[PDB]
């Protein structure tokens, strides 16, 4: 929809899309995360995490170490533009962030930081 997108992650370790657009006229942008399938957060939880391409690797690796009770995300991470909670089949969440945070010349990627998931669960976000 407008200034918002709906994203799904499933039991197959797949987001429903690998590309998100943000109209530059938006002041705030909202990602609505959902989870088809039947599984639970502790073995197939997913989140939606947004950073620069260059920072993705560090966010994923620090998140893997941070544990489940921290959504597999290091607290107070300066590299994270936006994040949702970790959800499971039936659990759902949304995140809204400031479009001004998306700087020029920067390439952004969104991904899941549940351990090992980033290998398949990643994509790109850019301004339109
Ligand atoms: Cu995941």
Q: How far apart are CA 38 and CA 78, in angstroms?
A: 33
Give how many domains the chain has, as a whole number. Answer: 1
Q: What is the resolution of this structure in A?
A: 1.9
Integer Cα distance of 106 and 98 in angstroms = 15
Experimental technique of record? X-ray
Question: Which residue range forms the structural domain that includes residue 125?
Answer: 1-128
Classify 4 as helix, strand or coil: strand
What is the spatial distance between Cα 89 and Cα 86, in angstroms, rounded to a whole number? 11
CATH number of the domain residue 22 falls in: 2.60.40.420
Asked if 38 and 59 touch (Cβ cutoff 8 Å), the reply is no
Ligand 1 center from residue 4 Cα (angstroms): 21
In the annotated binding site for Cu cation, the residues are 46, 112, 117, 121
Angstrom distances, CA of residue 3 to CA of 6, 32, 55, 94, 95: 11, 11, 25, 13, 12
56 phi and psi, to 5 degrees? -50, -50
* 25 CA → ligand 1 middle, Å: 30
Which residue matches tokens 């994923």?
60
E-strand stretches of the chain: 4-8, 19-22, 28-34, 49-52, 82-83, 93-98, 108-111, 122-127
- Whose tokens are 């351990």? That residue is 115
Tokens at 42, concatenated: 């502790």
Q: Tokens 């489940």 sit at which residue?
A: 68
């Amino acid at each position: 929809a407008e200034c918002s997108v709906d994203i799904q992650g499933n039991d197959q370790m797949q987001f429903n899309t690998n590309a998100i657009t943000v109209d530059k006229s938006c002041k705030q942008f909202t990602v609505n995360l959902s989870h088809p399938g039947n599984l639970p957060k502790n073995v197939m939880g997913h989140n939606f995490v947004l950073s620069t391409a260059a920072d993705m690797q560090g966010v994923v690796t620090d998140g893997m170490a941070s544990g489940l009770d921290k959504d597999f995300l290091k607290p107070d991470d300066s590299r994270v533009i936006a994040q949702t909670k970790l959800i499971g089949s039936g659990e759902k969440d949304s995140v809204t962030f400031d479009v001004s945070k998306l700087k020029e010349g920067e390439q952004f990627m969104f991904f899941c930081t549940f351990p090992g998931h980033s290998a398949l669960m990643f994509g790109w976000l850019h301004l339109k």
